[PDB]
Design a protein around this ligand. Structure first.
Ligand SMILES: O=C(N[C@H]1c2ccccc2C[C@H]1O)[C@H](OCc1cc(F)ccc1F)[C@H](O)[C@@H](O)[C@@H](OCc1cc(F)ccc1F)C(=O)N[C@H]1c2ccccc2C[C@H]1O
Lengths: 99, 99
């Protein structure tokens, strides 16, 4: 589809068998979701944005469905104020910026 | 133009007769640039990101050229890690997300 930017570009995603709301964020290098339980081992990481850095748990090889599209990639979990779908997964669904 | 997201969506902008690099960020509600001098009076604003909040200066009716497209709107100035072009200006240039 084609998404306008008059409002925040929020979409529904399916992960770990759960439906959540997330933001399509071209300014985010990676994908970060609010605290939740995911399978497998994880690695600690620090990510920075406006305001500073936060510590997150890094999980690799996670399957996510974005608007009916299946994508696989690294997913970070931590105290983010909103669920963020970053570039690492946006590329997999063939998302582009156009004007 | 059509921009893929395999790399950061950086473009050249022109403001105050100077060329700068900025990120096209659909996840940012507003446009914020690194410390610089702009004309007129400013008002205070607080913006929150992934790591907390930062105080910025708000300037209105500022001319800014993005990838050749002229836009006139609100620009925030403050301790941002990178120059960010937010939805307020992305909509002025007709930018949309597609997949
Ligand atoms: O921190 C960032 N990337 C980092 C990131 C994020 C997730 C995972 C990894 C990485 C690392 C880095 O890319 C991005 O900023 C630029 C940025 C880019 C970069 F390239 C390096 C450092 C940077 F600061 C960030 O994802 C923004 O896309 C956006 O974050 C999601 C979000 C959306 C909301 F609607 C509300 C709250 C919220 F938090 C955000 O902070 N929006 C707020 C904002 C911004 C400017 C003006 C006003 C307002 C109010 C909000 O909209």
């Amino acid at each position: 589809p084609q998404i306008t930017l008059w409002q925040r570009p929020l979409v529904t995603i399916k992960i770990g068998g759960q439906l959540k709301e997330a933001l399509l964020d071209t300014g985010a290098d990676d994908t970060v979701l609010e605290e939740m339980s995911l399978p497998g081992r994880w690695k600690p990481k620090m990510i920075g944005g406006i305001g500073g850095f936060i510590k997150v748990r890094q999980y690799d090889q996670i399957l996510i469905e974005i608007c009916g599209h299946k994508a696989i990639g690294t997913v970070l979990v931590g105290p983010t104020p909103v669920n963020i779908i970053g570039r690492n997964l946006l590329t997999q669904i063939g998302c582009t910026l156009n004007f």
